[PDB]
Nucleic acid binder design. Structure first.
Ligand SMILES: [Mg+2]
Ligand SMILES: [Mg+2]
Ligand SMILES: [Mg+2]
Ligand SMILES: [Mg+2]
Ligand SMILES: [Mg+2]
Ligand SMILES: [Mg+2]
Ligand SMILES: [Mg+2]
Ligand SMILES: [Mg+2]
Ligand SMILES: [Mg+2]
Ligand SMILES: [Mg+2]
Ligand SMILES: [Mg+2]
Ligand SMILES: [Mg+2]
Ligand SMILES: [Mg+2]
Ligand SMILES: [Mg+2]
Ligand SMILES: [Mg+2]
Ligand SMILES: [Mg+2]
Ligand SMILES: [Mg+2]
Ligand SMILES: [Mg+2]
Ligand SMILES: [Mg+2]
Ligand SMILES: [Mg+2]
Ligand SMILES: [Mg+2]
Ligand SMILES: [Mg+2]
Ligand SMILES: [Mg+2]
Ligand SMILES: [Mg+2]
Ligand SMILES: [Mg+2]
Ligand SMILES: [Mg+2]
Ligand SMILES: [Mg+2]
Ligand SMILES: [Mg+2]
Ligand SMILES: [Mg+2]
Ligand SMILES: [Mg+2]
Ligand SMILES: [Mg+2]
Ligand SMILES: [Mg+2]
Ligand SMILES: [Mg+2]
Ligand SMILES: [Mg+2]
Ligand SMILES: [Mg+2]
Ligand SMILES: [Mg+2]
Ligand SMILES: [Mg+2]
Ligand SMILES: [Mg+2]
Ligand SMILES: [Mg+2]
Ligand SMILES: [Mg+2]
Ligand SMILES: [Mg+2]
Ligand SMILES: [Mg+2]
Ligand SMILES: [Mg+2]
Ligand SMILES: [Mg+2]
Ligand SMILES: [Mg+2]
Ligand SMILES: [Mg+2]
Ligand SMILES: [Mg+2]
Ligand SMILES: [Mg+2]
Ligand SMILES: [Mg+2]
Ligand SMILES: [Mg+2]
Ligand SMILES: [Mg+2]
Ligand SMILES: [Mg+2]
Ligand SMILES: [Mg+2]
Lengths: 61, 70, 118, 263, 188, 595
RNA sequence: UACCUGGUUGAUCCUGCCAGUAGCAUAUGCUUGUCUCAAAGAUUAAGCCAUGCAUGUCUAAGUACGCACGGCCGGUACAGUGAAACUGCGAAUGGCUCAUUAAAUCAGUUAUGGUUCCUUUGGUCGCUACUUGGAUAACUGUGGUAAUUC
RNA sequence: GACGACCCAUUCGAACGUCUGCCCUAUCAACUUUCGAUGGUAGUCGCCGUGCCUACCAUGGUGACCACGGGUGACGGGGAAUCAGGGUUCGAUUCCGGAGAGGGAGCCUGAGAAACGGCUACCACAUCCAAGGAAGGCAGCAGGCGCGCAAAUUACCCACUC
RNA sequence: CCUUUAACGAGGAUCCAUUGGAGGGCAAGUCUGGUCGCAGCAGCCGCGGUAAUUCCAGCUCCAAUAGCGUAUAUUAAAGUU
């Protein structure tokens, strides 16, 4: 005996709606595209030191 | 002579031929003798014993489980 | 260090600046910072003077008077449009608005207009 | 340390009738400011995900509430920490069901589905009667509602039944010896009985006696009495058990003799 | 510092005050040998549970009869003691609780009941049977020789449905000594 | 774990009323041996470096805040990230590769610097201790959990991180790799970025030139271009400053600076000249013993690190007693009372060329018992005229062959010697004044025994330029022609070697003609300076000889640089190429002061 | 489990302590196969700190002339997604530590009929007008300083 | 529908008050008072009551039932170890309350701060400098030096709780 | 990681249990060699001066056991607050 939990959605649009995104990615319906938390962090802290169009970090990393 | 205070005490090196493991000007870790303030046994004026010679215990050197680092 | 109006000296001094002053930009609601500034009296020791022309002379300067001007941006509020083009109190102000031209090559030609407020 | 108001609530300090665990996490819903006090309310997230199991996390109850499905006292609440309280009406018309938050017997709220014709009014206890500008009489009820122009024979501690759609006080019961009541605080939190006495101590905490439908008597403070009927006749529908508080021995006898294990 | 953890735990035994007492020593060794226990901590454990039961019983026994608390907690302790079978249903009163002995709880272990019910050839065989997953209580396979067997559960002890001793594929020894006929004398 | 000693010189430490309690409370000074020799005097409190055990006792019983506590660093299995064999060099730990910025490394010869770059490249599995038979990457992944190097190495192994390494030498592989003219451009990783690099870096003059007809500065610019045109993310430049002229170094620093921003980790080896304040971001220092062990310290900001490591005594956590003032030769010594006679010469105005290098010298003065150095951009004919005056060709219009035997030190050190350097220690022989000359060159701090017997092929650049040094002053000769000694030598090394050449050609009353590219050596090697002017490979008129001051001040005014002294270190720094501290120095012609 | 044992004497009976005995929590020594749970720079220096990160934020609904993309043709509140910047809100919560502090803090008990309270919920909203004024961001362009979120 | 808004009530609080409760010390027996100590009248200031502060009066207030002074390797409590019955010792530490951000001090914005992931000075440290100037606060999470008998990774993630 | 599962995986010589002790208090040897008031042991009483039940070792045995010893704070023993 082995026990778990199951859900049956009345459609695929409602199933694409609620559905925590990590569970959709268990069968291809979603794809978490980013790199790394520390990259997102250190980038944001460089963007904080420039004013106006932040070309060096919205484009040039 | 103790590091944190600078006081000068007298300590006991208990075993057969364990005084050979203790040169001069090497730091040793001492503990109490077992009566919390008093001289134990037939020894006058002594209240502590030596338990470590240089980061290595006097009971591993007494059984050969270790050796001094030089 | 920048010069600022009404610091009546030819020396350099430290002032406690707040919002609304010049030579300072706040970083937080209510912040005030002590900053160095130069007095407004002109002197031999500047790096630059900023000079504006008020009355034009006779001979065109070969570098800044030969060129032309642009409209840049048009007026965006309706009353400014009226006062600019001298319309009446009932004059249908939705057609005298400036159309900005574009045509960055590789895209079709085009015109924009700002949304009118009030 | 504490220069202003707080906004977090620790799971160990939350009210006990929420019946929470101690291993999910350090934090609790912390109901937002509303018409009911913090220690006497029941947030929406706890009522939906814990007692009804409709949701499984906080995201699910957030996206249930963000679809305009839940109505508390007629109006549509979108907040998931709204402090729902005593004698309130929940309405979920996508499934056609209405509830009513009332303490059952053991000092905690029950799940008390009611008929749609009963989910139209609610009973309210009067706390204050003052006069505004131009001599207009006002009311203040136990859930912050204010009523202008009540009939000038309703006073404090009396109960008024109000229409949920329009306000507009409909009828009222008077605080008198012989009237059904439910206790809403203290040790007898949930028990129902008739008054039969009211002891008076000028300056502090006039106490009131009660005697339920089996000859048991218990007292409380006047601040916790709630008249809910004229006498031996409730105006709202009573839950299962009807605030009788059968002792632990009778509890065990009825749980064993009935052998209530499953179907 | 704040964490979602629990720190509740306790000891389950107590050492004896007199460390070297010949009578206590040999009495606890008699008890270890006849029930096939591993340690003396496993005797001090049962002693601790019996002492706590006795303390609770004597505590309830000093209240006056007709006290609701005494009635409730006594009728509960008695029922819970009969549920494991260390008390006769014909006694069922707080006076008989102070007559129990340590070998009423050591009797009711699973290792004892597996030998005593006849699935094993000794208690020292029974411990290695239980600890090697051969024994099943209803549908559950129980790995633990200290599993205190309730009363109604007494009928249901037998062998695991996938184990050599009853409806099971033979172990790795009967399958290489058999492979000896094929891969030990037929292929090598 | 370490050794502990005390530093005592601090604010107004006076044994006048200190009551000398330092010696009153020491275990070592009581047992008989001399540790703290301080009595009521007019002296600064004395302490030894080897006699005090430490134990902090002398610190806890002083009334005035004089005595402190410091460490001496030595190996005791500090995670030993790489070992080679028994009694052989070991590295301890590496910095995390700071992304989006220049992480520099500043260190000496011997101590670990190439080993770090090789491991950070993924090319070398770090030994982490004792040997694994295969190079097992599971060691580095399991040893460094809980750190950022775990993810970095796991992403190295998945092919997503492409690393590029600079060759530590340009002279090691003009033998195996060969590239055909024109096609050498088309073979590179990209087409449109070649123009941007060649235009900013100045390969433009020589892209279509014969690759064998080039000089060493063009080979460095070619290596630079070939490395930068390859798109990757990890980039290692093992001393890109090595034998480039100062404005070449500046534009190469600007071109690698142009590639910091788009998330590509760049690690440069950086015993560099004083151009610091826009050309590297964080720096890390190196500690250890050159022939035995090394460690890299935590990352520091560039100015902070240069200053505390140029002071030596300032770093806050940990210390080492070395790195005295070594950036220059503040120890002034000059006196010439023996120079009663001299044997001067006068060369005519020879002008030569091979196929495209127009060269022309002016007849000038050729002194004796005195030195002369020349300078200029690479390609103005500095080795060309040297070895043509030694003699290769053009006996057509005048010409005086050196009647003197000539000592000669090349820049292209790559000997073809089967055997060892102990052999060529006998082709030329030390049968000469056996007094300290080589033991005062290097005997105590550098162990010249490593240069007596070694493997000639695996020798480091330092010891290579040192056998280049020893090739000169051991052969019977009277005129020294030394070309680019400063290469693969660090600050003290460069200075000590140049000074050795100076006062060893001084006492024997002979002449030296020096080639240089680093300002500090061009200053402290001569009083006469010939300026090399002209556009490379079009016309480079070798200027008439002059003195040092006018020569240098007319030379560097053609590069648009200037140098600023330092009031506390006397260490010359560049300005920004315009600044309010530079503008007046430029119009006044003085590019250095405090003579 | 409401418990004692050795030591003053040639031997005895006491006072009386030293030592033994069991737990508990800090350190340390030797040794360690499996599995669940899980304390952890408090003690001494509330001593000093290299480096990275820990507070930000937009819906149909405050201001869209960035050609930044982009439409079926243009802007006639003007398409649509929407960088930047102005504006509104939050940053007074949480986290950390225990130096100070002896009717002080704190705990139970009561009082504001002696006060303030963003927000939430409920009451209150009538004694040129078919819509007013000028002026700063972003953006464009010229710069200053060794150097900064100038 | 969204947003905004004077006033009242409700909610979340905050602040100031009532009664009772405290470790060792007499080698601490008298303490407090124009440098407000206790009370009275009028005011200033404060969100409000109030010597909170000012002017003018009165001479009061506390103590052997331990006041006043000193010490604490003292943050308080819910609680922890041991325990026949009574007790003894511990509580820096995950919940509640208080206090602080190297030491003092003064303020801006704001409903709410005497805020330090805010500002302004002095003291103590300490960083860069082109010597004119500029910049700082890990008793937050990792990490490092020092101190010691004595205490962990410069990791991954917002999937759970909020 | 655990749990579920394949395929391999034990003869006892290794897929090798330690920490303290054996005069008394206090469970366990007047067994054999070495030292000879020395080395050392010993919380206390006490062991060692040529026939040592206590030292150094070998063998044997006792206690708890994946744990056991030591220094210190504190509680019971203490009806020695
Ligand atoms: Mg368009
Ligand atoms: Mg508008
Ligand atoms: Mg807080
Ligand atoms: Mg909330
Ligand atoms: Mg006597
Ligand atoms: Mg005797
Ligand atoms: Mg004792
Ligand atoms: Mg397993
Ligand atoms: Mg601390
Ligand atoms: Mg930092
Ligand atoms: Mg938008
Ligand atoms: Mg808000
Ligand atoms: Mg705010
Ligand atoms: Mg901590
Ligand atoms: Mg005091
Ligand atoms: Mg009080
Ligand atoms: Mg309280
Ligand atoms: Mg209170
Ligand atoms: Mg409202
Ligand atoms: Mg008054
Ligand atoms: Mg008054
Ligand atoms: Mg008096
Ligand atoms: Mg006092
Ligand atoms: Mg005091
Ligand atoms: Mg304290
Ligand atoms: Mg206390
Ligand atoms: Mg008790
Ligand atoms: Mg506490
Ligand atoms: Mg403390
Ligand atoms: Mg802590
Ligand atoms: Mg409180
Ligand atoms: Mg504070
Ligand atoms: Mg500090
Ligand atoms: Mg606000
Ligand atoms: Mg502050
Ligand atoms: Mg804070
Ligand atoms: Mg700041
Ligand atoms: Mg901080
Ligand atoms: Mg930290
Ligand atoms: Mg944390
Ligand atoms: Mg240490
Ligand atoms: Mg520890
Ligand atoms: Mg440590
Ligand atoms: Mg989350
Ligand atoms: Mg775990
Ligand atoms: Mg043994
Ligand atoms: Mg022994
Ligand atoms: Mg023996
Ligand atoms: Mg014994
Ligand atoms: Mg015995
Ligand atoms: Mg003998
Ligand atoms: Mg013998
Ligand atoms: Mg005691």
């Amino acid at each position: 005996k082995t026990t778990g939990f199951g859900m049956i959605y009345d459609s695929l649009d409602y199933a694409k709606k609620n559905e925590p995104k990590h569970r959709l990615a268990r069968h291809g319906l979603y794809e978490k595209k980013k790199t790394s938390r520390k990259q997102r962090k250190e980038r944001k802290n460089r963007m904080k030191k420039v004013r106006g169009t932040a070309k060096a970090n919205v484009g040039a990393g | 002579q103790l590091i944190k205070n600078g006081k000068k005490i007298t300590a006991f090196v208990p075993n057969d031929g364990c005084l050979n493991f203790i040169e001069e000007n090497d730091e040793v870790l001492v503990a109490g003798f077992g009566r919390k303030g008093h001289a134990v046994g037939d020894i006058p004026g002594v209240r502590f014993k030596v338990v470590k010679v240089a980061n290595v215990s006097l009971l591993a050197l007494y059984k050969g489980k270790k050796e001094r680092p030089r | 260090f920048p010069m600022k109006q009404g610091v009546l000296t030819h020396g350099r001094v430290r002032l406690l600046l707040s919002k609304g002053h010049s030579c300072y930009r706040p970083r937080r609601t209510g912040e005030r910072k002590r900053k160095s500034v130069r007095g407004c009296i002109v002197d031999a020791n500047l790096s630059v003077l900023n000079l504006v022309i008020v009355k034009k002379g006779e001979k065109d300067i070969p570098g800044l008077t030969d060129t032309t001007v642009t409209r840049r941006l048009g007026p965006k509020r309706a009353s400014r449009i009226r006062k600019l083009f001298n319309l009446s109190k009932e004059d249908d102000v939705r057609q005298y608005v400036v159309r900005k031209p574009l045509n960055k090559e590789g895209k079709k030609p085009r015109t924009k207009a700002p949304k009118i407020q009030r | 340390m504490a220069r202003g108001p707080k906004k977090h609530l620790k799971r160990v300090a939350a009210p006990k009738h929420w019946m929470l665990d101690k291993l999910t996490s350090v934090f609790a819903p912390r109901p937002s400011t509303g018409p009911h006090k913090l220690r006497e309310c029941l947030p929406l997230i706890i009522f939906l995900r814990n007692k009804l199991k409709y949701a499984l996390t906080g995201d699910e109850v957030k996206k249930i509430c963000m679809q305009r499905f839940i109505k508390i006292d007629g109006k549509v609440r979108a907040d998931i920490t709204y402090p729902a309280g005593f004698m309130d009406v929940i309405s979920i018309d996508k499934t056609g069901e209405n509830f009513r938050l009332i303490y059952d017997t053991k000092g905690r709220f029950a799940v008390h589905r009611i008929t749609p014709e009963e989910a139209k009014y609610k009973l309210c206890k009067v706390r204050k009667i003052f006069v505004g500008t131009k001599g207009i009489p006002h009311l203040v009820t136990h859930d912050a509602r204010t009523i202008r122009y009540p009939d000038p024979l309703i006073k404090m501690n009396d109960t008024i039944q109000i229409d949920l759609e329009t306000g507009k006080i409909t009828d009222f019961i008077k605080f008198d010896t012989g009237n059904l009541c439910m206790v809403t605080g203290g040790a007898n939190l949930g028990r129902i009985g008739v008054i039969t006495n009211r002891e008076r101590h000028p300056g502090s905490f006039d106490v009131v006696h009660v005697k339920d439908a089996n000859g048991n008597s218990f007292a409380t403070r006047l601040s916790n009495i709630f008249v809910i009927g004229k006498g031996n006749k409730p105006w709202i529908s009573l839950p299962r058990g009807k605030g009788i508080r059968l002792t632990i021995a009778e509890e065990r006898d009825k749980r064993l003799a009935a052998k209530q294990s499953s179907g | 510092m704040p964490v979602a953890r629990s720190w509740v735990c306790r000891k389950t035994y107590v050492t004896p005050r007199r460390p070297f007492e010949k009578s206590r020593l040999d009495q606890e060794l008699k008890l270890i040998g006849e029930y096939g226990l591993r340690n003396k901590r496993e005797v001090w454990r049962v002693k601790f549970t019996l002492a706590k039961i006795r303390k609770a019983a004597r505590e309830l026994l000093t209240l006056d009869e007709k006290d609701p608390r005494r009635l409730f907690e006594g009728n509960a302790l008695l029922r819970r003691l009969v549920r494991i079978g260390v008390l006769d249903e014909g006694k069922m009163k707080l006076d008989y609780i102070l007559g129990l002995k340590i070998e009423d709880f050591l009797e009711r272990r699973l290792q004892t009941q597996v030998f005593k019910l006849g699935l094993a050839k000794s208690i020292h065989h029974a411990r290695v049977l239980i600890r090697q997953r051969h024994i099943r209580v209803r549908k559950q396979v129980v790995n633990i020789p200290s599993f205190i067997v309730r009363l109604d559960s007494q009928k249901h002890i037998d062998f695991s449905l996938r184990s050599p001793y009853g409806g099971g594929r033979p172990g790795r020894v009967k399958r290489k000594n058999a492979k000896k006929g094929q891969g030990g004398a037929g292929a090598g | 774990k370490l050794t502990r000693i005390a530093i005592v010189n601090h604010d107004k430490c006076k044994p006048k009323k200190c009551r000398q309690e330092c010696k009153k409370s020491c275990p070592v000074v009581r047992m008989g041996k001399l540790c703290i020799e301080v009595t009521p005097q007019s002296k600064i409190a004395w302490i030894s470096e080897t006699l005090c055990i430490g134990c902090g006792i002398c610190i806890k019983k002083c009334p005035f805040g004089a005595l402190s506590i410091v460490n001496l660093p030595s190996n005791l299995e500090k995670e030993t990230t790489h070992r080679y064999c028994a009694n052989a060099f070991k590295l301890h730990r590496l910095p995390i590769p700071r992304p989006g910025e220049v992480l520099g490394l500043v260190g000496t010869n011997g101590i670990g610097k190439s080993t770090a770059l090789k491991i950070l490249a993924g090319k070398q599995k770090p030994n982490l201790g004792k040997y694994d038979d295969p190079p097992d990457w599971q060691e580095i992944l399991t040893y460094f959990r809980g750190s950022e190097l775990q993810n970095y190495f796991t992403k190295i192994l998945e092919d997503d991180l492409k690393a590029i390494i600079k060759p530590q030498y340009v002279d090691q592989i003009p033998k195996a790799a060969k590239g055909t003219v024109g096609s050498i451009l088309d073979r590179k990783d990209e087409t449109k970025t070649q123009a941007i690099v060649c235009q900013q870096l100045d390969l433009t003059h020589l892209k279509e030139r014969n690759v064998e007809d080039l000089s060493g500065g063009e080979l460095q610019r070619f290596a630079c271009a070939v490395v930068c045109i390859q798109k990757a993310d990890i980039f290692m430049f093992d001393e890109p400053s090595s034998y480039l002229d100062v404005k070449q170094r500046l534009k190469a620093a600007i071109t690698i600076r142009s590639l910091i921003n788009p998330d590509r980790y760049i690690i440069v080896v950086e015993h560099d000249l004083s151009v610091l304040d826009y050309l590297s971001d964080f720096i890390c220092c190196l500690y250890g013993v050159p022939s035995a062990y090394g460690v890299v310290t935590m990352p520091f900001s560039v100015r902070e690190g240069i200053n505390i490591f140029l002071d030596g005594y300032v770093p806050t956590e940990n210390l080492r007693f070395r790195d005295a003032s070594l950036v220059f030769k503040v120890a002034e010594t000059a006196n010439e009372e023996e120079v009663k006679k001299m044997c001067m010469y006068k060369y005519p105005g020879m002008k030569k060329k091979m196929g495209e290098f127009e060269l022309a010298i002016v007849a000038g003065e050729f002194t004796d018992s005195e030195i002369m150095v020349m300078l200029g951009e690479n390609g103005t004919g500095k080795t060309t005229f040297i070895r043509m005056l030694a003699g290769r060709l053009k006996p057509d219009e005048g010409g005086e062959v050196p009647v003197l035997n000539v000592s000669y030190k090349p820049q292209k050190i790559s000997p073809k010697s089967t055997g060892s350097v102990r052999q060529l220690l006998h082709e030329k022989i030390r049968d000469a004044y056996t007094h300290p000359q080589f033991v005062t060159d290097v005997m105590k701090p550098l162990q010249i025994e490593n240069i007596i017997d070694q493997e000639v092929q695996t020798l480091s650049g330092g010891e290579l330029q040192r056998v280049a040094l020893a090739l000169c002053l051991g052969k019977p000769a009277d005129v020294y022609l030394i070309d680019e000694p400063s290469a693969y030598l660090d600050s003290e090394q460069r200075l000590m070697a140049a000074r050795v050449v100076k006062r060893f050609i001084l006492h024997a009353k002979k002449t030296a003609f020096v080639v240089e590219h680093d300002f500090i050596m061009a200053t402290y090697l001569a009083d006469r300076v010939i300026v090399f002017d002209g556009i490379p490979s079009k016309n480079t008129v070798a200027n008439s000889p002059q003195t040092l001051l006018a020569g240098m001040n007319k030379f560097l005014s053609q590069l648009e640089i200037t140098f600023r002294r330092d009031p506390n270190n006397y260490r010359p720094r560049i300005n920004k190429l315009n600044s309010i501290k530079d503008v007046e120095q430029k119009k006044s012609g003085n590019y250095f002061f405090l003579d």
